């Protein structure tokens, strides 16, 4: 399959892309806009990019908003209470159906890489079972990673350590955690030591719900980053929801950044979720409660954006569109500068792929898998400004989605 | 013309709407979904609403971002400096071209009512001249209101009072202001006394850039509300950008609400703009900087959302889509409760029409103008969750915009 007249990110030239046997066989710069060629796909000057990534979503809880009742306070903690109620009626078939629907939404919006957290503080491990199967069933659409996420705590929930271990043995690819939610500070610390030992013993990645709270003294991030640094596993470690960093003492935070850089760990921010769940315990002025995304990125630390929730006990909205999240993130994090906008797609493509350790299985380079999108925009700035539609999604060299270009009629 | 199978807001039944001679002739509930009729428009269960309203935009400055240089700090004050530079090359024809392009964007997204601020601290009054003409030229698409907006101050800019007066005499429908930007507190107060006297002398509406600053002592809102209350002109007065209220002392703000309610004035919030321009003088934690929208609404005070800028010296993004702004507002203002979501379109339709004093020239009621939209969603919640496309826009009984329903193919 051939694509002509395609823009690539942050370049002025038009390119032809040759796809063959499921891989990118050739990328060639063109002298100028070319007339059509033997039923090649004409990008018509539109941007070709690698697929969008959703590096952090909770597929087990998706589409369960209001069951059996609503999160009235809009807080993390009531969300957990409501989820606990919902868990009493989780079945594998229920989970499968909701997960597949939400995966469909993500596919519709160009996402081909997904990392889902699954609550393993559930003695049935029903959702985990369903999602491990879904990983195989939906492989034609996405590459799914699964995180063993101990929602109610490792040290603070009955048999939490056994459940984490069992989840990993069952085949979860990533070790999760929630140290800020453990019952005492010391148990928060021991939970991080445990989960890092677990990941090392079974050779898994790590992605931890780190400090998802507005408390300036929630500092489990330092424990996680130090373990990653000492163990030499930074590239394999992600800190999600470091919301407390947005409230840290500034002298401490400056000192902390030295460790963060040295550790090599990744960061995920969920700006629509955090703007909703954070700042709930302030009056006025009301803090944003989002981590220091612009500052991490300027420091050379890999950070990216994620949806987190779609219609679940924590967040009543969501539609699968990562460009909406990008927009939110750029506004809330004060990243609407000219230079920011020219490369903003980094935060929902390249940087996210790095967090998921996709390596050579991601990116528009010869020899890599033929997974790519054609976006209805010519550069990063226009993509976010217009919320550009995904016109074509190609996966393993085949078109799996085709949208018509929007046409408006006037009198 | 006839529309069948239409939902109306916050109602379960389907409705047929009969439009004749530019007005709504009849609205009738149906027993159920009906098969198509004699060239009737089939809403197919989609929502019919009165048009979106853009109650606060700066059309004189639209599409000038980066000219002659960029707002690097992303602040209100640097924006004013950049605009001051751009004013040196403003012409009526330049203004007309940019304004008409942005009006086209608003039309594409179902806006039929627009209130634009125009900077009248410009001895040429060039943009105002162009926009008064545009008001007539674009009448086929929108009903435009023009605010005489003294960007560089009434008391603090050469001949500011003369310029305000001349702008009103030229035909600006609304008197503007910027008391928080006046050089001293006493001049901020005198500016409000002057602009209210001006509005009364000429019988005009009022819409003031009130306290667009994170300073908890910026309290010109109380002066404006008191003048409106005393003069009995509450309904004709709007306070835009009361960002400082998001930082007020809470005891003061409680006392203040008593006056705000009694005064009857309207409020406009610009959440995407304020999240960008506000919080810039904090470090961490970083305030949201948006007025107390949910609290105003709960108190029975009319409040609504607006875009403010499209690609201008203050804000680099913008596409005309008020639903994007609604989404932002609901998130930043903590209004994602179930009750909130079921009526959220209030903030971009009914409430905004009230701010603009549209009266019986707005709304789906028999006898009123046949101005309405068909949205690709069945209720308020779905409209914001899906960012529903405007499928049809009808103005004065005629279709002025038609979109085809998005169709995705899966090969
Ligand atoms: C969605 C979600 C679930 N659970 C949690 O601890 N945090 C979240 N953001
Ligand atoms: C856009 C804009 C222009 N001028 C101003 O004073 N405030 C604004 N938000
Ligand atoms: Fe999460
Ligand atoms: Fe404004």
Ligand 1 centroid to Cα of residue B409, in Å, is: 34
Of A66, A284, A404, which has the smallest distance from its Cβ to B248's Cβ? Answer: A284
Nearest to B47 by CA among B89, B73, B12: B12
DSSP string covering A74-138:
--HHHHHHHHHHHHTT--HHHHHHHHHHHHHHHHHTTEEEEEEEEE--STT-HHHHHHHHHHHHT
* Cα angle A353, A358, A363; round to 5: 65
**What atom of ligand 1 comes closest to residue A314's alpha carbon?**
1
Experimental technique, in short, is: X-ray
CA dihedral (B340, A316, A324, A6) positive or negative: negative
Residue of B nearest to A281 (CA): B334
Query: CA nearest B95: which of B138, B126, B136, B58?
Result: B126
**Residue B121 Cα, gap to closest chain A Cα (Å):** 27
Q: Say how far apart CA B387 and CA A105 lie, in whole Å.
A: 14
User: A184 CB contacts (<8 Å, ≥6 apart)?
Assistant: none
Domain spanning A52-360, CATH architecture? Alpha-Beta Barrel (3.20)
Which residues of A are identified as catalytic?
A: 212
Q: Tell me the CA distances in angstroms from A191 to A149, A158, A209, A241, B315, one per residue in order.
A: 12, 14, 12, 17, 44
Q: Give dist(CA A140, CA A146) in Å, integer.
A: 17
Phi and psi torsions of A145, nearest 5°:
-105, 145
DSSP A153-219: -SSSSTTHHHHHHHHHHHT-SEE---GGGSSSHHHHHHHHHHHHHHHHHHT-EEEEE---SS-TT--
Whole-angstrom distance between the N-terminal and C-terminal Cα of chain B?
A: 38
Span between the terminal Cα atoms of chain A, in Å: 39
Q: How far apart are CA A299 and CA B207, in angstroms?
A: 43
Distance CA A218, CA A289 (A): 13
Cβ atoms of B237 and B200 closer than 8 Å: no
Strands B143-149 and B111-119: parallel
Give SS3 for B326.
helix
- Final resolution, Å: 1.8
Q: Is ligand 1 within 6 A of the CB of residue A273?
A: yes
How many CB atoms are closer than 10 A to CB B300? 7
Q: Is B161 helix (H, G, I), strand (E, B) or coil?
A: helix
Judge: A336–B318 Cβ closer than 8 Å, yes or no: no
Alpha carbon distance A361, B237 (integer Å): 59
| Residue B153 Cα to ligand 4 middle (Å) | 14
Joined together, the tokens standing for residue A149 give: 């996420």
- How far apart are alpha carbons A379 and A346 in whole angstroms? 12
Strand order in the sheet with B52-57: B52-57, B111-119, B143-149, B174-175, B205-209, B237-240, B266-269, B303-305
CB pairs under 8 A between A and B: 145
CB distance B141 to B180 below 8 Å:
no
Classified as helix, coil or strand, B372 is strand
DSSP string over B241-259: --GGGGGS-HHHHHHHHHH
Nearest to A6, CA basis, from A373, A382, A401: A373
DSSP tag of A356: T
Min Cα–Cα distance to chain A from B175, Å? 30
Q: Which residues of A37-56 are buried (b: 16+ CB within 10 A; e: fewer)?
A: eeebbbbbebbbbbbbbbbb
Ligand 1 centroid–CA A156 distance in Å is 16
Bridge partner residues of B399 (DSSP): B394
Burial class (CB in 10 A: 0-12, 13-18, 19+), B169: exposed
Residues in chain A with CB shorter than 8 Å from the CB of B338 are: 66, 70, 316
Asked if A270 and A308 count as a contact pair (C-beta separation under 8 A), the reply is yes
What is the CATH code for A1-51+361-405?
A: 2.30.40.10
- A144 vs A63, A113, A132, A134, CA distance in Å? 18, 6, 9, 9
Nearest atom within ligand 1 for CA of residue A58: 1
**CB distance B400 to A411 below 8 Å:** yes
Q: Which of A188, A74, A59 is nearest to A117 (CA)?
A: A59
Q: Is B366 a catalytic residue?
A: no
List all residues 6 or more positions away from B378 whose beta carbon is below 8 Å from its beta carbon.
B7, B45, B46, B47
For residue B183 the two structure tokens come to 């050089």
SS3 of B299-344: CCCCEEECCECCCCCCCCCCCCCHHHHHHHHHHHCCCCCHHHHHCH
Ligand 1 and A122: CB distance under 6 A = no
DSSP tally for chain B: helices H, then strands E: 13, 17
- Calpha distance B355→B189 (Å, rounded): 23
Tell me, rounded to whole angstroms, the distance of Cα A378 from its chain centroid. Answer: 24
Cα A19 to its chain centre, rounded Å, is 27
- Please give the Cα distance from A75 to B184 (Å, whole number): 42
Beta-bridge mates of residue B14: B7
Domain segments of chain A: what residues?
A: 1-51+361-405, 52-360
Residue B314: count other Cβ atoms within 10 Å of its Cβ.
Answer: 22
Count Cβ atoms below 10 Å from residue B405 Cβ, excluding itself: 9
Nearest-atom number in ligand 1 for the CA of A277 is 9
- The two domains A1-51+361-405 and A52-360 share their CATH topology (first three levels equal): no
Pocket of ligand 2, candidates B209, B240, B270, B280: which has the most ligand atoms within 8 Å of its Cβ, to mutate?
A: B209
Task: Report the alpha-carbon distance of residue B381 to residue B342 in Å, rounded.
Answer: 6
Beta partners for residue B117, in sequence order: B147
């Amino acid at each position: 399959m051939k694509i002509i007249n395609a823009r690539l990110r942050r370049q002025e030239a038009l390119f032809t892309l040759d796809l063959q046997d499921g891989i990118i066989h050739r990328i060639t710069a063109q002298a100028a806009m070319q007339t059509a060629d033997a039923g090649a796909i004409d990008a018509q000057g539109r941007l070709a990019i690698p697929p969008f990534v959703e590096p952090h979503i909770h597929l087990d809880a998706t589409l369960t908003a209001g069951e059996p009742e609503w999160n009235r306070s809009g807080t993390l903690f009531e969300g957990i209470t409501r989820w606990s109620q919902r868990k009493a009626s989780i079945t594998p078939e229920d989970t499968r159906q909701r997960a597949l629907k939400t995966i469909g939404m993500l596919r519709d919006f160009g996402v081909q890489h997904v990392r889902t957290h699954v609550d393993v503080t559930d003695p049935s491990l029903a959702a985990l079972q369903a999602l491990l199967a879904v990983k195989q069933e939906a492989a034609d659409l996405i590459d799914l990673q699964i995180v063993a996420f101990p929602q109610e705590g490792i040290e603070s929930y009955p048999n939490g350590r056994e459940l984490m271990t069992r989840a990993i043995e069952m085949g979860a690819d990533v070790v999760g955690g929630i140290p800020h939610y453990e019952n005492t500070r010391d148990k928060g610390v021991s939970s991080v030591m445990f989960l890092m030992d677990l990941a090392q013993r079974y050779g898994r990645l790590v992605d931890v719900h780190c400090d998802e709270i507005d408390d300036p003294q929630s500092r489990f991030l330092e424990v996680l980053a130090e373990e990653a640094r000492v163990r030499g596993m930074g590239a394999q470690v992600t800190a999600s929801h470091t919301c407390a960093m947005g409230s840290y003492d500034n002298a401490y935070c400056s000192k902390l950044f030295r460790l963060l850089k040295a550790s090599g760990i990744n960061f995920i921010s969920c700006p629509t979720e955090s703007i909703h769940l954070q700042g709930r315990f302030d009056s006025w002025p009301k803090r944003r409660g989002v981590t220091r995304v612009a500052e991490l990125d300027r420091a050379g630390i890999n950070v990216c954006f994620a949806q987190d929730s779609i219609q679940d006990p924590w967040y009543p909205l969501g539609n699968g569109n990562i460009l909406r999240i990008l927009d939110a993130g750029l506004h809330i994090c004060h990243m609407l500068g000219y230079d920011d906008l020219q490369r903003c797609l980094d935060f929902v493509t390249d940087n996210s792929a790095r967090a998921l350790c996709l390596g050579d299985n991601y990116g528009l380079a010869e020899g890599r898998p033929a997974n790519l999108l054609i976006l209805d925009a010519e550069n990063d700035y226009e993509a976010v400004r217009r919320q550009a539609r995904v016109l074509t999604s190609i996966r393993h060299g085949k078109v799996i989605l085709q949208r018509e270009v929007e046409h408006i009629r006037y009198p």
